[PDB]
Design goal:
This is part of a larger assembly, with two copies of chain A and one copy of chain B (about 110 residues).
Chain A: H1 4-7, E1 18-19, E2 25-26, E3 37-45, E4 57-62, E5 86-89, E6 118-123, E7 130-134, E8 137-138, E9 143-144, E10 153-154, E11 157-158, E12 162-167, H2 232-255, H3 286-299
Antiparallel strand pairs in A: 2-11, 3-6, 3-12, 4-5, 4-10, 4-11, 6-7, 7-8
Helix pairs in contact in A: 2-3
Chain B: E1 3-8, E2 21-24, E3 29-30, E4 46-49, H1 57-63, E5 71-76, E6 97-98, E7 101-102
Antiparallel strand pairs in B: 1-5, 2-4, 3-6, 5-6, 5-7
Classes of the chains: A alpha+beta (about 325), B mainly beta (about 110).
Chain lengths: ~325, ~110, ~450
């Protein structure tokens, strides 16, 4: 038996291996992100061993396309910074993980995550470098040059008796490096929710409801304008309708209570382009000329073949 | 031999002395990412009298440095460990240790 | 437009910067009318646990369908693979309330449609081989107008409840437990003399669902038709004798920790790599991260690594993955440069990615390889030994529900995400083909 348990235990490859692992949970604040970007966190309580295991605090960023963040149904053991769709940071002795990598580049404290810590985190727009500040101190930059594909968000993971403060808007303490806050995607209509990070469950007495997956940006991509050919028999009516558009633009300021004057103003109601379509030169009326031209190019391009059926006026 | 990270500091100045028994909580694991021992596991704080030369060498070298509350990482050289023999059943021949020692008290 | 709040697309904003624009466009279209012109013109199969495969009884569960879409809900034998769709086998027996048809080996119209927020249901009589479907108290009839939906199904390996949601939907099931709070079993059911699942049990019935994340797996003999061979110099040759030819990834079985090389023969365009075991990306793409050092400030401190997986590309492509602690790349006697010589202590699956153009697509294997990889490690002549596999990245396999997750509270002032009560796994991991199961 000594011979068995010398030649067969310690290699740990032939038969299996098992141990208990603490339930990881990651949570994201409902802000997808395609300026630069930035956030904070402060830690309230850690209770670093309410398990017989080191409890983790991974703070950082993640991509989106792909990315099923499943508890126990992802990578090894459940984690953060374990797949390459993830980029996080934070330890007792604060070193990162990015793809289950343990590299221990230092800090000017060699600090824990204690219950009194400020984690400043920044992501750079299109210069793909991530850097993390502890208490304003730069923490010896590591992250560079990633796959900018899919959106981005903060992820932060935790598994203990742990509660922490989001500073996302009640901002508390935030340095400016780079700059733009996380508060710049709540602008148009959206809200500030924080969710479980992607939920094949939703826990309930009766039945957890289910979830078909998803359907998955501020670069403006319209229909192209200038590459549309105008025949001249359309161009006659186009110039006459640009004249009609300019005289309606005169009538618009007549309705809105304006006056012709040599001063190009809007604070004394004096406007220098209330004269006709051609009596304005082609550096103030050409912006309406080409507007009507491209409008009829689009009308000949949007599949509405408007034929000439009446008189042009 | 022993190469120490400070995981959590203590005070830095109340480091132990000969004739003392240190009360630790070591959770030592292999080089390869696999756990072999944990005094967090059976919830008994391990004790040992420095100067009587009980424990393996690198563990005693690292317990000389830590302070009254310092948690550290005693990455031991494989000749400072069990060695070319290894521990027959747990540690393989010529293996490296990555401890995790949270020193607590003195006696 | 600096940091001006006009960083918006047009359709996403309010109805304030649209009034003057749409009105001036209507004025231009009225100049056109004044000129006389008018402008005239995927899956999450949620299923119950295989040990609950009921096989002689009278069972029912009532399924709330919530939002419209692909909702294929009914019973199945446990051999329903999540990868292929529902119904198009002899193993799925379910009803699709949307579009009013029921699924077995193709289409057959049945029943009705469902209001968004109704509770559907599916009975089974095991003894008398009839499997009834309900909706909202009304027994769903055939096109013939008869109650018994499916008939004379064989009682084989039991039946398990299955819900197959679609794209952006929500479903809700009912698994006994809740006798007073059964919705439509109290109307039809109780009076007829049926029982739900969990009148007796004292658990929650743990479910399985497919993952989006693909994981590799052996090549079973009942594949489409892909025949890896075992030939012994020391070849594992191939073939893809099908019409279905999307992309077939290939992993050799066991990794290398951190001297000997390894030859891949190409018959027909073809990628060769060294997968680190976290490669779960199944597309027609070419993608995966550079961590830099710090000298307490940086300032030299750059080159660590990149890895994730590994890239290469007349008569035969005889490409060779030469190893070590680093990597290089040689091919067909020459040395295809730009090698990714970076591994601190990684594990590397020797791997190959390809599309099927023909049958007979590959072969496998200044010393050689096996004895740096097995247990006996002089052993300088190479040989294959029967642990070796030729894995295929399959898209989906079922995965456990994890009946309790964490007690969690998110909040408002400070946004206090808060978890206090700990929960632990019981998680093994197989070491030879590195991945973690619980």
């Amino acid at each position: 038996q000594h011979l068995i348990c010398d030649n067969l235990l310690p290699g740990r490859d032939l038969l299996l291996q098992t141990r208990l692992v603490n339930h990881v949970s990651s949570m994201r604040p409902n802000i997808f992100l395609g300026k630069k970007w930035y956030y904070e966190l402060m830690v309230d309580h850690t209770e670093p061993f309410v398990t017989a295991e080191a409890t983790h605090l991974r703070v950082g960023w993640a991509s989106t396309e792909g990315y099923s963040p499943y508890p126990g149904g992802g990578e090894e053991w459940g984690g953060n910074g374990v797949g390459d769709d993830l980029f996080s940071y934070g330890f007792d002795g604060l070193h990162l993980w990015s793809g289950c990598i343990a590299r221990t580049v230092s800090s000017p404290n060699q600090h824990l995550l204690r219950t009194d810590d400020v984690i400043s985190c920044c992501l750079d727009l299109s210069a793909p470098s991530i850097s993390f500040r502890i208490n304003g101190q730069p923490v010896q930059g590591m992250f560079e040059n990633f796959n900018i594909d899919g959106l981005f968000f903060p992820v932060v993971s935790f598994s203990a008796g742990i509660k922490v403060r989001f500073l996302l808007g009640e901002f508390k303490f935030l340095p400016p490096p780079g700059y733009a806050p996380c508060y710049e995607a709540v602008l148009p209509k959206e809200k500030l929710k924080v969710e479980h990070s992607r939920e094949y469950k939703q826990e309930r007495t009766y039945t957890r409801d289910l979830l078909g997956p998803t359907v998955s940006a501020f670069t403006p991509i319209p229909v192209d304008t200038s590459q549309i050919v105008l025949p001249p028999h359309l161009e006659r009516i186009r110039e006459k309708l640009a004249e009609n558009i300019h005289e309606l633009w005169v009538m618009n300021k007549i309705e809105l209570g304006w006056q012709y004057g040599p001063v190009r103003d809007d604070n004394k109601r004096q406007h220098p382009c209330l004269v006709e379509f051609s009596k304005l030169p082609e550096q103030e009326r050409n912006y309406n000329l080409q507007m009507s031209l491209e409008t009829l190019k689009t009308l000949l391009a949007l599949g509405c073949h408007v034929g000439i059926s009446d008189e042009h006026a | 031999g022993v190469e120490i990270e400070t995981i959590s500091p203590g005070d830095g100045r109340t480091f132990p002395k000969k004739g003392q028994t240190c009360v630790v909580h070591y959770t030592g694991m292999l080089q390869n990412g696999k756990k072999f021992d944990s005094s967090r596991d059976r919830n008994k704080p391990f004790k040992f009298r420095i100067g009587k030369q009980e424990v393996i060498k690198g563990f005693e070298e690292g317990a000389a440095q830590m302070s009254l509350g310092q948690r550290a990482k005693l990455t031991c050289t494989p000749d400072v460990a069990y060695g070319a023999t290894g521990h027959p059943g747990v540690i393989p021949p010529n293996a490296t240790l990555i401890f995790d020692v949270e020193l607590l008290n003195l006696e | 437009q600096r940091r001006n709040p006009r960083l918006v697309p047009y359709a996403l904003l309010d109805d304030r910067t649209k009034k003057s624009n749409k009105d001036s466009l209507r004025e231009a279209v009225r100049t056109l009318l004044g000129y006389g012109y008018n402008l005239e013109a995927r899956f999450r199969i949620f299923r119950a646990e295989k040990t609950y495969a009921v096989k002689a009884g009278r069972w029912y569960f009532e399924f709330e369908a919530v939002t419209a879409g692909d909702m294929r809900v009914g019973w199945s034998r446990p051999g329903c693979q999540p990868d292929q769709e529902l119904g198009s086998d002899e193993r799925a027996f379910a009803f699709d309330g949307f579009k009013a048809q029921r699924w077995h080996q193709g289409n057959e119209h049945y029943g009705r449609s469902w209001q968004a927020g109704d509770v559907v249901g599916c009975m089974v009589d095991m003894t008398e081989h009839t499997m009834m479907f309900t909706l909202n108290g009304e027994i769903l009839l055939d096109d013939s107008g008869s109650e018994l939906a499916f008939k004379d199904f064989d009682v084989g390996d039991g039946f398990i409840p299955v819900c197959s949601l679609g794209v952006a939907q929500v479903g809700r099931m009912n698994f006994g437990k809740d006798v007073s709070t059964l919705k439509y079993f109290t109307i039809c059911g109780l009076q007829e003399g049926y029982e739900p699942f969990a009148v007796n049990t004292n658990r929650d019935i743990t479910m399985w669902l497919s993952k989006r994340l693909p994981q590799f797996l052996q090549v079973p003999s009942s594949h489409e038709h892909i025949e890896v061979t075992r030939i012994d110099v020391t070849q594992k040759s191939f073939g893809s004798q099908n019409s279905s030819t999307d992309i077939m990834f290939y992993r050799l079985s066991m990794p290398i920790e951190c001297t000997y090389y390894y030859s891949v023969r190409i018959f027909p365009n073809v990628w060769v790599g060294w997968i680190t075991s976290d490669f779960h990306q199944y597309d027609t793409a070419f993608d995966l991260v550079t961590v830099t050092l710090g000298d307490e400030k940086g300032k030299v401190h750059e080159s660590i690594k990149r890895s994730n997986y590994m890239v290469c590309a007349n008569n035969n492509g005889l490409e060779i993955g030469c190893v070590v602690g680093l990597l290089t790349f040689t091919a067909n006697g020459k040395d295809l440069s730009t090698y990714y010589q970076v591994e601190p202590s990684t594990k590397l699956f020797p791997a190959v990615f390809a599309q099927a153009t023909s049958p007979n697509v590959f072969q496998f294997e200044a010393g050689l390889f096996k004895s740096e990889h097995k247990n006996p490690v002089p052993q300088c002549p190479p040989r294959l030994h029967v642990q070796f596999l030729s894995h295929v990245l399959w898209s989906r396999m079922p995965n456990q529900f994890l009946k309790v997750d964490v007690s969690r509270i998110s909040e408002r002032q400070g946004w206090l995400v808060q978890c206090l009560e700990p929960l632990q796994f019981m998680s093994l991991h197989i070491p030879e083909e590195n991945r973690s199961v619980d």
